[PDB]
Amino acid sequence: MIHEVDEVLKALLKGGALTDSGIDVAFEAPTRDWAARRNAPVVNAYLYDIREDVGRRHRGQVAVRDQDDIVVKRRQPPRWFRLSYLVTAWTKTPQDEHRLLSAVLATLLPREQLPPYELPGALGAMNLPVPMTVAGVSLAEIWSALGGELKPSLDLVVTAPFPAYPEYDAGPPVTEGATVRIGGVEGDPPMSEGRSHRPHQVAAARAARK
Amino acid sequence: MIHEVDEVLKALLKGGALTDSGIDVAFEAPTRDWAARRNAPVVNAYLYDIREDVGRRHRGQVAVRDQDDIVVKRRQPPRWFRLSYLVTAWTKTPQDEHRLLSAVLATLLPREQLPPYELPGALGAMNLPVPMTVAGVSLAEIWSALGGELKPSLDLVVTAPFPAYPEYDAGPPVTEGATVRIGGVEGDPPMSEGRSHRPHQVAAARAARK
Amino acid sequence: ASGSRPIEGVTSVAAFVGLAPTGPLNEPTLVTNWTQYVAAFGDFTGGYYLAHSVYGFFNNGGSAAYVVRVGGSAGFGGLEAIDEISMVAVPDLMAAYQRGAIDLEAVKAVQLGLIAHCELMGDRVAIIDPPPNQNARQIRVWRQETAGYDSKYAALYYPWIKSFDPATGQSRLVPPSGHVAGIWARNDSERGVHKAPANEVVRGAVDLELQITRGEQDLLNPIGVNCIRSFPGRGIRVWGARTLSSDPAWRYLNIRRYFNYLEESILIGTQWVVFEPNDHNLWARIRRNVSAFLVNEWRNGALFGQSPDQAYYVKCDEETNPPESVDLGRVVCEIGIAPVKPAEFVIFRLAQFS
Amino acid sequence: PKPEDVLVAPNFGIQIDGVMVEYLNSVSNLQIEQDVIRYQQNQGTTGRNNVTLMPGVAKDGSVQVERGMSQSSVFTQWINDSMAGRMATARKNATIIVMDYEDNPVKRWNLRNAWCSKVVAGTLKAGDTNALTETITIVFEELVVE
Amino acid sequence: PKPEDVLVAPNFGIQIDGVMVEYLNSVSNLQIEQDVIRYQQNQGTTGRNNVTLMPGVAKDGSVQVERGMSQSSVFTQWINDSMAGRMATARKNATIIVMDYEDNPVKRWNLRNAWCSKVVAGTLKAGDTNALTETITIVFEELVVE
DSSP states (O other): OHHHHHHHHHHHHHHSSOOSSOOEEEOSOOOHHHHTTOOSOEEEEEEEEEEEOGGGOOOSOEEEEOTTSOEEEEEOOOEEEEEEEEEEEEOSSHHHHHHHHHHHHHHHSSOSSOOTTTSOHHHHTTOOOOOEEOSOOOHHHHHHHTTOOOOOOEEEEEEEEEOOOOOEEOOOOOOSOOBOOOOOSSSSSOOOOOOBOOHHHHHHHHHHTO | OHHHHHHHHHHHHHTSSOOSSOOEEEOSOOOHHHHTTOOSOEEEEEEEEEEEOGGGOOBSOEEEEOTTSOEEEEEOOOEEEEEEEEEEEEOSSHHHHHHHHHHHHHHHTTOSSOOGGGSOHHHHTTOOOOOEESSOOOHHHHHHHHTSOOOOOEEEEEEEEEOOOOOEEOOOBOOSOEEEEEEESSSSSOOOOOOBOOHHHHHHHHHTTO | OTTTOOOOOOOOEEEEEEOOSSSOSSOOEEEOSHHHHHHHSOOSOSSOSHHHHHHHHHHTTOSEEEEEESSOOOOGGGGTTOSSEEEEEOHHHHHHHHTTSSOHHHHHHHHHHHHHHHHHHOSOEEEEOOOSSOOHHHHHHIIIIITOOOOSSEEEEOSOEEEEETTTTEEEEEOSHHHHHHHHHHHHHHTOTTSOSOSOBOTTOOEESSOOOHHHHHHHGGGTEEEEEEETTTEEEEEOOOOSOOOGGGOOHHHHHHHHHHHHHHHHHTGGGTTOBOSHHHHHHHHHHHHHHHHHHHHTTSSOOSSHHHHEEEEOSSOSOSSSSTTTTOEEEEEEEOOOOOOOOOOOOOOSOO | OOGGGSOOOSEEEEEETTBOOOOBSEEOOOOOOEEEOOEEEEOTTTOOEEEEOOEEEEOOEEEEEEEEOBSOOHHHHHHHHHHTTOHHHHOEEEEEEEEOGGGOEEEEEEEEEEEEEEEEEOOEETTOOSOOEEEEEEEESEEEEO | OOTTTSBOOSOEEEEETTBOOOOOSEEOOEEEEEEEEEEEEEOTTTOOEEEEEEEEEEOOEEEEEEEEOOSOOHHHHHHHHHHTTOHHHHOEEEEEEEEOTTSOEEEEEEEEEEEEEEEEEOOOOTTOOSOOEEEEEEEEEEEEEO
């Protein structure tokens, strides 16, 4: 679900407070070769690394039920992955670069998380918030790795809830109640059928289920 | 607000203690190519990185009221961002470079913070102090990633308050007071209207505001 | 103290309207002691029951009073500007009626006006005293036909107390309200509002105008007439905790008094809500304050419930709809409580065999 | 969605009746606690052990809120009213609200009869870079979660 | 602006009446603390539990001051005056001031009847680099924030 996070970032940057000019948002790596060809004020949103948010992981058999108010599937809670974006502003004049970076920071500040309504279909099917943290705390080594030159930058962290889908199937529902067989441990009295739940008890349980 | 700080730095450096000569303050990256073209003594104030001051962040619903002494907006405290500037002095003679660096230190030391009125309109609208730290406290890696060569430098840290204002609105003021309806928990006595605040009580509460 | 204090319980102040020598006219004067009363108003220097009523109120135990003088030789509209008042009386109405200067119709009109005024303010209950020299059948007829009051804010007390008058050194007949109200205050100082102020002693009473037997009480009690009877080894005691209301749900004095006390305390504590935003924060604050106030009442045993949820419930969330009562600048809170009824009759059964 | 499906971000707030405090830097642990009471007895005729744990009274605590040092002295006035014994106005009802995104209150902790008892100024150092921090210890007789 | 809006930087100072000290390096925590008394009771008629927390007394304390030690021996003379029993002159009123950016006093902790109780010399090391410091412990009967 990175092809939804990048689209959300592009829509937010284009549709944010930077409506004065039609700036271009690019995900290309800001290397020297890339920087030597651009001729328009642009915003680079290069993906840097992918890590799993081990602090927000949850383990447990989550029940999934149909319209009959009976559980039919067993799944696992989604695992959160942290995606880091290096955000930079490229413009001919350094003060223009500074004001572009300020505008980007101002348009990214108010969104602490992202409601599922804004998210696209694939990510919005989760119906879960998508945290988005700007800045919030090595950059020299990263910039050297891309081969570019150190510039002021924003570290945008997005927490994508990737799914774990083993999708275990539960057994058929128990409709005729439970039957209990009782007897002696050593087998001196033979085990009996022991009967089962009366229809009145089953009806009462099915009525109280609502 | 980055450009507002830049303008503040330029005005402070030009209008500080370095009035003997018309020195030039530049924000360009001090790379080898940039250093090989300059022919006049200059002061470089290159922006290095942007980080959020998580230690000065405050969370709460700040009340904003109009002239009627009634709150009409609910905002959030601004978040402080740490902007780092690498400050260097470039001159042909190394002793002249040392003298220029000493002059910059002398002109930047006495300003621990910044008064709101001396700030530009965008920065001064917050009416909050802006801390400024000179050489408060790795530089080899920064210079290597920048592309230049190691030189004595100042790590000028400026704390810019970016307002994370959600502009959440509040409900209309209560003018008729409060009404309380009382009755039985199980509903044996029917719930009554219970009346409301007397007009004299409302008038006294309104007058006690002043 | 009205902008920062939370909801707290309320002293009981009795407002007395009548005639008295000297003092102001139609000006409610706060009196805290009998010495203050004689320093401001006059002592027993005339044929007025106001002095006797105040003396009985303070002797029986009274935190404060609001004396009002309208025609004292040698008015209820002025009591609408006071909030702490919880009961009212008109001792000198029967004093004027006895002389024949005022007919019974005017007395009935005055009592109806007093009851209507009590129903308006909503925080006080009136005390009614019948004309003197009346029997059980006579008082039943008077209460059912001539003065058929029907209100939840009125309590009638039939027999007249005979107290001591230092002016003449003899015993004089006075209405019991001035004493009875004092008894109420004693309850609020010794057993709380949740307990019916029935089994109490009229300290200032020496004798009664007519002893009431159980046969006559069997007819007087159901019509909402509270009696005062003398018991051997117990003295003069009030017998009856019923109001002059036809509603079975509001036929007990203690329930109405507790409801009025709770309403007044909540209204006093919620005085800071004026000009506050009508959002979820104000509703949460109101709910928290009301719950913190009511849990103390639940702990004291005034309300019935194993846990606070079953004894009281507060609903102030989303009840004030955005287009009704919110555009009008109003906030509505719903409170439900479970009081405890008193045990009026005690029945014993003795069996010879064992 | 489901109540368990919506997580909670550290977007909190406080509200003290009578004390004008808008924002807090941090809030300590507030817990709801109870006393467990073990008792061990042997079953009498046969001798098998049977240890039982059972409920005891609930407990009061001390929620502390830390706010940056400024000119305002609301906590100073609160503690000054406390030290003089005027507890008719010193005992206040407090609320700690924690909300998810969209600024909708999710959980509320109501402190009944909360009353501050300790104000501590942060250590002052000449070379210190961080802002001064004020620590306030607010003790409460009862804490009700809502 | 608003009193809460303006923050406080670690720019401070001290003033001791009779002791010529002008600057310090650090100041320990200054606590305004009140004793809390907890009492648990049960309602006689219903048996419900009520735990009440009420006030104690103002607590005396002590804050350590650590300055760059030098030839000056003002604190040495202070502790010498206190050591010989001349407490008429040993007890001095102290003030701790925290200022704003404009060097304008904001908070002034007044310290009543303060006398030095302990002077500690920093550990001396042959290969030590930083300056050698001196620690002073001062006990004040009362600490009123103004």
